[PDB]
Paper text:
Expanding this pattern to hpphhph can produce larger α-helical barrels. Here, we show that pentameric to nonameric barrels are accessed by varying the residue at one of the h sites. In peptides with four L/I–K–E–I–A–x–Z repeats, decreasing the size of Z from threonine to serine to alanine to glycine gives progressively larger oligomers. X-ray crystal structures of the resulting α-helical barrels rationalize this: side chains at Z point directly into the helical interfaces, and smaller residues allow closer helix contacts and larger assemblies.
Our hypothesis was that these should direct larger and smaller oligomers, respectively. Encouragingly, the new Thr@g sequences consistently scored best as pentamers: for the a = d = Ile variant the pentameric assembly was favoured outright; while the a = Leu, d = Ile variant scored equally well as pentamer or hexamer. We determined X-ray protein crystal structures for all Gly@g and Thr@g variants. As predicted, the Thr@g peptides formed parallel pentamers. Significantly, Thr@g with a = d = Ile has a wider channel of ≈9 Å than previous designs (≈7 Å), which increases the scope to functionalize this variant.
Residue numbers in the entry:
A (entry chain A): 1 to 29
B (entry chain D), C (entry chain E): 1 to 30
D (entry chain C), E (entry chain B): 2 to 30
The structure:
């Protein structure tokens, strides 16, 4: 359903952000 | 409908953030 | 209601973050 | 549970918003 | 599960909050 699919999309995108910010932390530290 | 529309707006904004943070990571990466 | 108000607060804060990360990208690289 | 979890998310996102503003301010002329 | 997905989002956002603080400390330190 539309609510479930949107929440899944949010969860996936937040995990992408978490991976990118970890890559930034690795480049800097 | 208000809940569906608001969480869609949140999803779109988070996708904007995901693109920008990747641009930042790439500029600083050797 | 509490759920509606919290989701509104989340949406507003994420928009603030999206603008700050765009300002970081602009300051670093334009 | 749902109300409390989304309140926790709202608070954590406000913490992130403060930290990202600190980063933006340090690098800005 | 809606509750479980929102809990997973809350956990990922807490990871992001920690990582961004580590980045801010390395840049400002």
């Amino acid at each position: 359903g539309e609510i479930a699919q949107t929440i899944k999309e949010i969860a996936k995108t937040i995990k992408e952000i978490a991976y990118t910010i970890k890559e930034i932390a690795q480049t800097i530290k």
